Write a protein that binds this ligand. Sequence first.
Ligand SMILES: C[C@@H](c1cccs1)N(C)Cc1nc(C(c2ccccc2)c2ccccc2)no1
Length: 136
Amino acid sequence: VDFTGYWKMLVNENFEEYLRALDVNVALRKIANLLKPDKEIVQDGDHMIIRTLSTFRNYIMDFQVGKEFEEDLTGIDDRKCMTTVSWDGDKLQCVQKGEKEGRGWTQWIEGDELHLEMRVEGVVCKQVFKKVQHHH
Ligand SMILES: C[C@@H](c1cccs1)N(C)Cc1nc(C(c2ccccc2)c2ccccc2)no1
């Protein structure tokens, strides 16, 4: 599996409850639900760069698969986590150790679709992106 590409958001399901489970305030929650970020991903061996891009915020993950790293989430839910992204078959599994229980996400590909499931304290958000070729 190779996630390299430019991806455009198609659906964003149960995002508001996921943010509510992170204790994001109502007003910020309302702003975040209106965002439809693109994803620019470069998979370079075990080195992974995931750029989540929007006018409101560019969130950059730059990590080595299998290596724990300190993830700065202050601009999101005002927290930090010790995060580990690992391979699980053809799926990418992320565990975010921190204050919130069961926090993490799973990423995988189906055809021309990038699938992203985010989780925290039983709440599941599901996002699907489409691979695109017009670069901005
Ligand atoms: C970005 C996301 C992931 C990146 C790679 C796997 S998940 N993560 C940080 C949690 C998350 N923030 C968001 C979303 C967001 C922004 C502000 C507050 C709460 C959520 C967002 C972040 C950045 C750009 C545009 C919208 N929606 O989800």
